[PDB]
Design a protein around this ligand. Structure first.
Ligand code: HEM
Ligand code: HEM
Ligand code: HEM
Ligand code: HEM
Lengths: 146, 142, 142, 146
């Protein structure tokens, strides 16, 4: 990816103002509810019953934070996203067997939760930079096997 | 397909946000054109195809009007949107991958404007409904 | 949705190839497991999950039986396949991206066996029908 | 992509026995019929009426052959697929604005037409190698913009 300096600043501002303890749990929760077949990939999580089980399940929360922290690493290394994600790409698309289409679903849920937090500050241009970022990360997560 | 529960949640949500549908349509369409530049070719005939644009504003009013129509025809989307499926999928040959893009941007825009009302429960049903729309729009391709 | 023309072409095609459905199901399932290894986890409980396999053979008979059921219920796929949608999308939580994969492999296998009968006209209608199946199977997820 | 020597031989055998004048026109024809919105991207092609227009349209044929010849170049350079496709990736995903999902549709039609030509010789393992090839090519065609 060829990044602009405007894109670098937007992406950096975004991450710098994000509360990982708030966004990660809500993004993952929501993804497990809106696209419930994704619950299947999470072995050992507990009582995943209804919608308010998932929403206040501390294991899903814990894990929502690990996802945002995994994004945090690509943000810190934007010129080398592809190779900072070999570990994760290998676990997700060869030890977990998660269909590539799902990284795209979760990424859409992070965007929706981030739009509800930032409100009007989440402009089209902000959205355009964050989306370019995540498409790079999603690209790096499947990258391993064809 | 939608359940009576899905139908009721869409009607109640639309009931809450439908006042601001002109701003929702302008905003969602602005974002599709900026964030997903491959979609700009369908509106290349307009003089101004940037977010401020008088044309985006007028056309977003029309798109939210088509959504309002899908809400009132929620029990048979296929028949309710047949004229629009004809227009897009037959005439303009809009590529259907693009309906998921516009639907995503509508969700982002609603989330941006009504974070409190856009709960996860409201999101599952609105998402099933919007995919029912895309599917109804794709009816006349083949 | 399918037209009476689509329905008739599926019935006529199935009429021509349905004799060999046991071989079609074994072959299509073998190929999904080899070419799309991410799908092997749903059958990890079988001792042998390689193309020769006695288990793949027995289960491919069953899958072609579900297709034969969709053909006979071609006018209401949603209701005709509700028990199977329950099984996959509720119980096994099979990820729906995988239904398009198995459908692709069935088309490859039919093409391999009946090149003459698998014309482009037959392919459009068989493809609309198979997507109607995937959609009927995805009914119980949410 | 990490290729095996068995994969290299399969892919090479395949291409070496293919009639481009037969496969390319049938793959493209079929794609324009099964997924008719793809006809939209082809400006100046002529009378694209019905199904037997498309099937015997010499312009669609001509163009089916250019697609197979474009694949021919990645076959000849498998360790560097990504960079042999910058020209094409740039035209398709920035001058033509073809949605990435469509390269996947056409690639599925080439496989179906190739399975009907090879018959029983188009085995699961053969299919597995050809599919890995095309997923690499498809990956290289969108590669340009996110
Ligand atoms: C798209 C962006 C994603 C990112 C950045 C991401 C990143 C991560 C990270 C950082 C972990 C922590 C595990 C460790 O430290 O070993 C993890 C675990 C995991 N993720 Fe993802 N992930 C993503 C998407 C997904 C999706 C869409 C799924 C679908 C189910 C998924 C399923 C899993 C699973 C099953 C685990 C393993 C947890 C365990 O060990 O029980 N991930 N991921
Ligand atoms: C939620 C999905 C959509 C809805 C409800 C919708 C609704 C509408 C409506 C109501 C019109 C006006 C029809 C008329 O004036 O006769 C229209 C026109 C149009 N739509 Fe859509 N549409 C949708 C998706 C899309 C997408 C995804 C694209 C392309 C990326 C698109 C491209 C167009 C174009 C190019 C026009 C004509 C405008 C002009 O000629 O100035 N539509 N649509
Ligand atoms: C064309 C689409 C499909 C059809 C018609 C179909 C049909 C069937 C049928 C008839 C059964 C037997 C049900 C029973 O024994 O009660 C079955 C079971 C099963 N299906 Fe499918 N299926 C389809 C797609 C898939 C896909 C894509 C997967 C996963 C990749 C899958 C995974 C399974 C599994 C794991 C079982 C249970 C077998 C066992 O427990 O040994 N199915 N399916
Ligand atoms: C997926 C594998 C594909 C390959 C290897 C491929 C390759 C090519 C090649 C080699 C050309 C010749 C043009 C030149 O010499 O300048 C071409 C042209 C073109 N292709 Fe593709 N293509 C692929 C898929 C697609 C798809 C899915 C579409 C969707 C419509 C598409 C649309 C076009 C268009 C619009 C042109 C331009 C023809 C013109 O200049 O009028 N291609 N492509």
């Amino acid at each position: 990816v060829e990044w602009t300096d405007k894109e670098r600043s937007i992406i950096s501002d975004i991450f710098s103002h994000m509360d990982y303890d708030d966004i990660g749990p809500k993004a993952l929760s929501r993804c497990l509810v809106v696209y419930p077949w994704t619950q299947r990939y999470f072995s050992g999580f507990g009582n995943l019953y209804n919608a308010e089980g998932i929403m206040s399940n501390a294991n899903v929360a814990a894990h929502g934070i690990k996802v945002l922290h995994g994004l945090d690493r690509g943000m810190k290394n934007m010129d080398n996203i592809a190779d900072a994600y070999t570990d994760l790409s290998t676990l997700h698309s060869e030890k977990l067997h998660v269909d590539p289409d799902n990284f795209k679903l979760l990424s859409d849920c992070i965007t929706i939760v981030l739009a509800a937090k930032m409100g009007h500050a989440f402009t089209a241009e902000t959205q355009g930079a964050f989306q370019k970022f995540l498409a790079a990360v999603v690209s790096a997560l499947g990258k391993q096997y064809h | 397909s939608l359940s009576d529960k899905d139908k009721a949640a869409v009607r109640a949500l639309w009931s809450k946000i439908g006042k601001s549908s002109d701003a929702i349509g302008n905003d969602a369409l602005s974002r599709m054109i900026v964030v997903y530049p491959q979609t700009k070719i369908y509106f290349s005939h307009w003089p101004d195809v940037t977010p401020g644009s008088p044309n985006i504003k007028a056309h977003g009013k029309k798109v939210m009007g088509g959504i309002a129509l899908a809400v009132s025809k929620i029990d048979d989307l296929k028949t309710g949107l047949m004229e629009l499926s004809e227009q897009h999928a037959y005439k303009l040959r809009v590529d259907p991958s693009n309906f998921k893009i516009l639907n995503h941007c509508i969700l982002v825009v609603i989330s941006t404007m009504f974070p409190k009302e856009f709960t996860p429960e409201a999101h599952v049903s609105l998402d099933k409904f919007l995919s029912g729309v895309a599917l109804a729009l794709a009816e006349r391709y083949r």
